[PDB]
Ligand binder design. Structure first.
Ligand SMILES: *[C@@H](C[N+](=O)[O-])[C@H](C[C@H]1CCNC1=O)NC(=O)[C@H](CC(C)C)NC(=O)OCc1ccccc1
Ligand SMILES: *[C@@H](C[N+](=O)[O-])[C@H](C[C@H]1CCNC1=O)NC(=O)[C@H](CC(C)C)NC(=O)OCc1ccccc1
Lengths: 306, 306
């Protein structure tokens, strides 16, 4: 028993991290087969940052301008292109540690693991959700750009995130591995504010099922609700609407615990209206929204990779 | 910026996990050089568990009785011994992925990363503290025994924990890699209760410094306290006494922020006596005690491994 914010094992991704330097800027790249992927802002200087012209900046760069190191091994760059906000550096050596992989664009509300890197060396690993406003609440300092987000399914690494920037509010924004930003953000030091965030309702319900599976059941009340009546309460507390698709995704947890999803909704309604009155759930004094239903089933059933 | 419960990258440890089966029980082992380390209760059956006689049980086992697999590769066992509560299985193949490593016995209040494994395959990674009562608050199911705890310092893996059991209260207990239990626990299904737990005061102070470094400063008050006056308040709230050694360990964070440790103690005193009145600190509605001062400096300075 027990329930923790668990990251995926990072070993498959650690083998792909390199250091990319162009001029004085050094940041991380992802080395898969004979390609290194990194944020295109590696080619900016201090006072390009307001509105860089990335195409003009790249045209002035040759292959030798890019210094790529995998540990203490130099990788020779033999070609470069730009795809949206990522650079693709073709190198003369394929990564012998390239895992089975996929590039995925994740939906808001989904979770992934972040491998935070500096100078191409891993610092740590933690679990993040793509917030409804397309930001993540991470831990990133100068030098962390090109750190990636991923999920593992059996033997396959699904890369979903590459780190580019921190908004003046302290939340984080980045791209998929095709270099399209999540949300309405640009790789410029400009005015750009995150949308109002909302709480991921299906995740909160998943975590309450996790609480029940682990023996924390004090919040279960005796009532039921309709989906429409629940959603009127969700709206008032800045929660996302619960859809029939979400009800269906919670079906396995409902079955395991014997608690109908609309009965769990009535318990959540009471928590939102009344608070927790000093009580914790799975050691938290707040309602947790960064566990998906699939995260809960994985952790509560002991799903392994490969 | 930002502050997350960050685990160490797990790749160095993932390469050492194997499956050990003796009879019907399958669990995890740690494969370093030509030795596999695993909990000795792999040799028990269902109705040995109340008071197993491990020496008599092992005497009945030969090398072929132990089936060890590293992925889909069988490792042939060529010798076995027992050291305290761990088995050491000598194998015919040295692990080619053996990292630089050390066996350490950690002190209560220190943190480590856990790589949760089933059938010798990694499931996930999370950060734990050794509680003052020598338990950990983990996430472990049947099949997780032999999962290990570790810290990484540069290139060196310090193994500190091997998982053996869950107490009837839902907290977790295990050994160092010499097979000595942390705390007064035994590898028997007997009556054994954890001591009353206490909150790790130096860690709470470290996390309040982390909050200040990341811009969450609402709780800083204008007062100071003496160490003796602070400790009278700590005792009442079931916090550990703060020692001069702890004051000294908090010196780097004090310097960075300009807040004297006894000034931070006066802010913590007010939080304990008055509560947070619905306010969060680094997204938490409770005082967090599973970050060491060294964890905070590592995360806030971007320390990498190798
Ligand atoms: C990565 C750049 N790199 O590693 O070279 C960096 C991401 C960091 C900065 C601190 N927190 C992060 O998440 N990205 C940028 O610096 C980015 C560059 C633009 C061309 C997109 N700008 C940015 O994030 O500005 C905000 C900021 C900078 C420095 C400290 C705090 C916030
Ligand atoms: C590991 C055993 N294994 O993998 O084969 C297991 C640890 C688990 C059980 C569920 N939670 C854990 O942390 N350890 C034991 O089963 C242990 C064996 C004794 C000989 C020490 N006994 C034990 O933990 O009893 C409590 C328990 C068992 C099963 C479910 C919940 C609690």
């Amino acid at each position: 028993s027990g329930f923790r914010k668990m990251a995926f094992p990072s070993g498959k991704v650690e083998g792909c991290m390199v250091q990319v330097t162009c001029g004085t800027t050094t940041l991380n790249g992802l080395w898969l087969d004979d390609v290194v992927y990194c944020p295109r802002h590696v080619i900016c200087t201090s006072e390009d940052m307001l509105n860089p012209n990335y195409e003009d900046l790249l045209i002035r760069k040759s292959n030798h301008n890019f210094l790529v190191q995998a540990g203490n091994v130099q990788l020779r760059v033999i070609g470069h292109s730009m795809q949206n906000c990522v650079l693709k550096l073709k190198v003369d050596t394929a990564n012998p540690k390239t895992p089975k992989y996929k590039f995925v664009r994740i939906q808001p509300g989904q979770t992934f693991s972040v491998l935070a890197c500096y100078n191409g060396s891993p610092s740590g690993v933690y679990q993040c959700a793509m917030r409804p406003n397309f930001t993540i609440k991470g831990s990133f300092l100068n030098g962390s750009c090109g750190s990636v987000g991923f999920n593992i399914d059996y033997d396959c690494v699904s890369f979903c995130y590459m780190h580019h920037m921190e908004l003046p509010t302290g939340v984080h924004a980045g791209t998929d591995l095709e270099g399209n930003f999540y949300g309405p953000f640009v790789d410029r030091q400009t005015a750009q504010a995150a949308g109002t965030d909302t709480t991921i309702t299906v995740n909160v319900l998943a975590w309450l099922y996790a609480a029940v599976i682990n023996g924390d059941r004090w919040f279960l009340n005796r009532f039921t609700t309709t989906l429409n009546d629940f959603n009127l309460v969700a709206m008032k507390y800045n929660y996302e609407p619960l859809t029939q698709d979400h009800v269906d995704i919670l079906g396995p947890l409902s079955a395991q615990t014997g608690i109908a999803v609309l009965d769990m909704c009535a318990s959540l309604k009471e928590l939102l209206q009344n608070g927790m009155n000093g009580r914790t759930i799975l050691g938290s004094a707040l309602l947790e929204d960064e566990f998906t239903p699939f995260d809960v089933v994985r952790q509560c059933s002991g799903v392994t990779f490969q």
